[PDB]
Amino acid sequence: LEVEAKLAEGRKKIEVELQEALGSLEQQKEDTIKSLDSQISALSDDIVKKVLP
Amino acid sequence: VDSTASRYASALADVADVTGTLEATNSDVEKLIRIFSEEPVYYFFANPVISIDNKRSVLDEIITTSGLQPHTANFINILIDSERINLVKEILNEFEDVFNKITGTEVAVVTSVVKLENDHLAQIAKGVQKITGAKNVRIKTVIDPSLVAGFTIRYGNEGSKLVDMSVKKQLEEIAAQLE
Amino acid sequence: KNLGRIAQIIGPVLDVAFPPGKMPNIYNALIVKGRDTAGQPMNVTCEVQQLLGNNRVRAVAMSATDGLTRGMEVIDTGAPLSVPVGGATLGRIFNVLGEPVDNLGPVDTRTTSPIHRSAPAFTQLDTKLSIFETGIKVVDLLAPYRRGGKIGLFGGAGVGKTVLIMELINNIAKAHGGVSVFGGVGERTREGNDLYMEMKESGVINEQNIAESKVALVYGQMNEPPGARMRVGLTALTMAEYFRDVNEQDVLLFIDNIFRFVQAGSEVSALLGRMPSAVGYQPTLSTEMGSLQERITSTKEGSITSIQAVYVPADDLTDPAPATTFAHLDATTVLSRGLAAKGIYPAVDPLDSTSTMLQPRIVGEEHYEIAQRVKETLQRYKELQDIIAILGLDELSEEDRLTVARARKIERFLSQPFFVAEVFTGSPGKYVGLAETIRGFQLILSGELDSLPEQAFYLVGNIDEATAKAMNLEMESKL
Amino acid sequence: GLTALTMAEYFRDVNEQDVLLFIDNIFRFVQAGSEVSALLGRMPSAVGYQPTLSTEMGSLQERITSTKEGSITSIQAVYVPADDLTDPAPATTFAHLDATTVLSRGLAAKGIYPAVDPLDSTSTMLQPRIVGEEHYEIAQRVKETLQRYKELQDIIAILGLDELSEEDRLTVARARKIERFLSQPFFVAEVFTGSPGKYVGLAETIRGFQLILSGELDSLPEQAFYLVGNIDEATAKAMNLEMES
Amino acid sequence: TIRADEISKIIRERIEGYNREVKVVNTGTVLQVGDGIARIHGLDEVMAGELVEFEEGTIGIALNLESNNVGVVLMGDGLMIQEGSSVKATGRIAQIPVSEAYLGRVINALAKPIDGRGEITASESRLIESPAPGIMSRRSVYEPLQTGLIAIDAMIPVGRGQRELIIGDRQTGKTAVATDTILNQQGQNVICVYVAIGQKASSVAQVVTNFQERGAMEYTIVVAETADSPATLQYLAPYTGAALAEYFMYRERHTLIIYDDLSKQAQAYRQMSLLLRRPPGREAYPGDVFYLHSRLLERAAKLSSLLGEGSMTALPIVETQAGDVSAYIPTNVISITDGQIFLSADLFNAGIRPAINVGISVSRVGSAAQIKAMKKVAGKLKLELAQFAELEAFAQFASDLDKATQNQLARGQRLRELLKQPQSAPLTVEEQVMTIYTGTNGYLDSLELDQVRKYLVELRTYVKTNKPEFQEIISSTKTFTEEAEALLKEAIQEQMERFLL
Amino acid sequence: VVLMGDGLMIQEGSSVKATGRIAQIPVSEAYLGRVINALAKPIDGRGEITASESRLIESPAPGIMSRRSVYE
Amino acid sequence: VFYLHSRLLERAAKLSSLLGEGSMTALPIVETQAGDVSAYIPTNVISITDGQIFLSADLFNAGIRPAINVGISVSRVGSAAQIKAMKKVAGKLKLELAQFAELEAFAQFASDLDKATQNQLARGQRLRELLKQPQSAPLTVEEQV
Amino acid sequence: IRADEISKIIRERIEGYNREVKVVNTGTVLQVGDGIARIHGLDEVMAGELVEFEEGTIGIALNLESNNVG
Amino acid sequence: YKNETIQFEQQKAINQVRQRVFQQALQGALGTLNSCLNNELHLRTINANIGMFGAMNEI
């Protein structure tokens, strides 16, 4: 029981850790999407010079 | 393809080929296609209800004004006797594909936004020929707003085999990145 | 924006010829601008079932094709059948098409959903096997239901199927927050009228203030053409999977009756000219059934749970229609004629009802043991009935004086007062938990309630009520 | 089938030998022919079978006959679909064969192996001028017992044994012993059961059957007969069941 | 998970090093789309069996190269394929991209992941229809494939490379038996593949969830088509599952393939072929129905040592209606598959899970399959059940059971208890050998029938914990040694004494 | 076209004219006691029925809301 | 065919008070071939129709005229249709008849049975005799009561 | 889509359309497969007449269709 | 297992960014092409394409 209940609580703690990590990653991804805009612009220009002959 | 419409058209070409009227017969067959476009004219020949005897008399008058080839006038008379006038349109279209085969010409159809000079076409028509294996190449042109600045040629037995570059590079790039 | 002309009308099957560019794909609805007998326009809705080539589709009419003329304009609607879904749909009898057939005017709904939809994806399903708690003592104990699973009622009429159906409709609204959707596939109009007026008497459909009701009724009649009886299974399904996807409820979808849906499909396939499959059923029978049954599933949001009536043709469980249907079913509930003669309501046969879900790993060890014991005790009593007449209750051994007595008490305990039947019988119904059911059959099978009379267990909800009823009976008897 | 047949036929014709032509399974040959026929567009005559079923079957079968230069002895297994001997493929094949050996499933459920249904199997050679008068008068008298037993089964299935008369009961006891005696362990089947197979010469088989019919072995139990080679084996086996205790 | 800062380098990479090669490609125009089968005008250089790709992304296999058009098996719903739109000849001929990266991914009929976990990377392609190994390139089945169910591994033993049919009525434990076999392959280097044809989507999800929970999705690919999905994909899904299995077969891995059911492939082929108006045969199933499964099941083979001794063990699952095994489909698959496993519904309703009808189940490769400990131990077992089929017969007829019959009948009930197991708790080979041995000798005769299953669980746990020398003998020597036999008994005496108090 | 009679007299090529109406029968109280055929024309040999209203043959059934439970 | 019969059968049912409470009772007659109630037309017409009155020639030669096989015959409307007077009388009758159909096997062996069982067989046979009627002798409701 | 349109036959027909002719003497083989020939011509055969092929085979004209002869 | 979730996440996000970014670049390219030399550069590309086709044919 006691070990089992402890394990269940540990599983909940792991879920909290995992739930939080995903949220942090999502926030980071949003910032990146906001960030490195020049790549976007220049990145856009990117294909253009090589797409055609 | 081997369907009844195709079967009849092939016969018509074979008799022309024997008698060396391939140019002469082809003009008449093109002339027929203008005739049978009209909904009213086609309907009169096609429907079962109008008497067959009346159909021949009208057909004979049509032949005289048209001045069709002696076999070509027969060929329509044969269709009428043997009830297959309901599929004349398929037969006429089918003949053009057969007629190219006999000569050894191949159609290609080449697509651009912008009309192009013969010199580019000459290279393409020579290029399709070697790649085709053709005796001769006959070129068909069409104008399209949608591509970019290139074009696509279609050739083969059908218009099956299409090799293009205009839009396709953009599409390829779109696919390429996702990889 | 696409206009076509009917090329031919052969029975309920239309062929529509479209211009070469603009062209409907399969399952799009077509609207046929027709005229009536007196000459006013009335329009027949179709559904494209084949693409015949040469820019020509083969549609199946959802209404009658008497009076349609070759060459009349057919407006391609560009989508499959859009059906009104939402709060507005509750308490309204609906056609196949989503038109109200109950005479209360237009459904003032701005939301419509197509009926041909893919199933919920493999990512989106919910794995956790949950028992659906109906609040009926027989069903929660002996034939438990999946939440998001399919149920088969093997009942006729006169066994109180409709009251049982209504209790479920009523209970889900009260215990849970969900709704129910009844889809009458090819239902007789007389029993479509009787059911609709039974819902108003039982307060399941609130006539005075409607859309406070608990049911959205969808009726496909028998005199509808055979393409209209297939798609009422999907109209009810689409309206039920609005409450799953948007309102996030726990829905009950009742398809009455599942056979009929299979039959109708077979008729349209035959009308369409397909070569018939084994036993004369359509060749697409495994797929048309699965295209329906796979939308009845429990996602992460909510869950729809279909309790669908099953007819077994020629009493053959190996007929393709029953066989195909049975694979999908998860629990079967057999409504017994013999229990309605005894007077036990609901007349769910506890020995012939089965469930995929009554496994110890699914319902827990304690629930399983009791259910198994109850069936055994009930089973022994059935065997002993011939013996008791011959030897009498005294002549039986002391164990079998008991398992006869306990079986009688158990039989009475299974019967329960319903909310819907309050009008008819006057005694108040009792919603009974799954725990109060399990705790109740322990006290009968452990023998701690051997002293109580048998008519203290009859038409009581909780185990405590039987004891309370028993005490009151003793006091009355003493008086 | 034709390729195999062609090679067999050449040996008989040119090497002038005697050839065995085992085929597994000629039903498949008909079934392949049936599959291709649908592609060919020929209308299907019965079930899905090709219209030229008798002819296709006939052409392959006719070539197999033994001539004055050599001989083909073909033993060919024929699948019977859904245990239905009235299917067109199995039914057409019957005309060609000189001896059919119809194996049963009901005998394989009981475990009598080989599961040869002894009443449905027929041979042309079972005639007194071919097999002699001794073999023939037994093989009838075996089949008369089994046939009688078969008739009895409808009655016994419901009432059971007890009702039968004493004549019927005696035949039933004999029939049961006879069915078991027919069962035989095989040399090939050692990898299944482990019991070594037994080659039973024809003379031994005739002798054993006479004893069972005669009754000298009426006192022995039935499982003394199950899966033994000779009748001597049954007797030796019978003692062990009785001795063991 | 920082993506955005490298995208300006990543986006450039995609454009970088792109050849843009132009080659002639065959294309065709869609004439009509109907009944899962498209007709395409054009394509004068498609090969039979070549994948032709439509505008919508739907993939079709070209099969009827008629003189004027091409018939195309639309792999997928043709619902968005609009008439007149173009097709492209790929030049590839009916291929599944296949690699190691499949393992642990749920997959579609066309081998595109449906588990929502991103793409799957394959260098190499195996054809969907590819020749079975010949008559030379096989060898005889001799390894065991331990299912972990006692009734199978003792009495209907499944070797590696064997086709072994799992046949029975609906809801008789067929999926569980197949699933149990997959669960039990954890130690071994076996790459189990699970093909779910026509089954409930919810049901497939539970199986997939179970594998992840039990950690068996490290070595499994789950090819799931489902009941909703179109007949063509269900028809073609096993061939996809088989194709994946081969990649490991010819790379010297060992493989298990589970086609669940092959009943529902046969109805999806009947749906496909009746819609094509092909003349039906018996039970309206076409004449190609035998050649349908036989192409699939002959690909499962123990390969010879010249090819590396790969194998593919096939467990196809067939549903029968009311236990009719004279039906056209189950009689077709019994004649293919090397031996079958009858799950009878009479035993399943009586609580005899796993409901293996032992009398009725054959394995052709019966005992060259077993290990030496098993062949010795389970030799006793096979006989006792044979006694006990006949002693349960006329048990109530004689009805005053002498102890010659009665103790053999009391032994028998206990023997049946050993065969009982809980779902998805497969046993190790040593446990099975140990368990079979205990039952055969009469050790459990004293115990109450409801005490047998609780005892043995204690005895196995006792033996793993107190006496691990027994596992080392059976795992290394693979023979029921005299040292091993004695070593078990001491635990049995020790364990039995402990159980009493 | 499904003939409501023997088609023996019809000659191929002879014209047929669509009536414009769809399968009515004259219906009245004056039918009570008359043996009539499928087109509601009397065959008992008693003469014309007095009828003033026409009923369609294919009339739609009463709806769900227009009925009542059977109680008589 | 299902649509054709259903279209015709659906037309006749009881109208509401706003339409005048007119009714239309359809009594279709379908003749089954060799008692195959599972053929294609009687399977269609049964599912359309509310009740069924099965007539069996094995009762018709046995003397039970009209040969209504009441065990099989079913009525969906049921006791809504009967008058109040009929409901009380019929209810007792159905139960007694049900008991007799359970004890048809005992009728050969009625001597070796107790009085309760014997009376039920005895009553049941009389009850069966009530049901019999000559052709075109329809009983009024009072006579049925 | 139907037999007797082999495009020898149609061309033979076109050439002789302005004609009258009876082919009743000899008939040309259109198809042969598996025991059965489809014969073009033979407008003088009678139902059941033996017809002899060029190789030397005797066949029976059962179907006298309007295009060809079974 | 929760960490494996993040591993996958880091991949999905990455891919999305890569794609969206590429998509834009595509947009810009399209725009420029729509403005790049109609008969001059258009013609040049046509010729190139043609050349490529020819090369392919030879192979």
Ligand SMILES: Nc1ncnc2c1ncn2[C@@H]1O[C@H](COP(=O)(O)OP(=O)(O)OP(=O)(O)O)[C@@H](O)[C@H]1O
């Ligand atoms: N060995 C077992 N012990 C306990 N329960 C089991 C066992 N095997 C199966 N079950 C349970 O029995 C039920 C039916 O089993 P399962 O789904 O495996 O059968 P099936 O033959 O696959 O039927 P279906 O045709 O529905 O797929 C399931 O709930 C399953 O988990």
Ligand SMILES: [Mg+2]
């Ligand atoms: Mg399963």
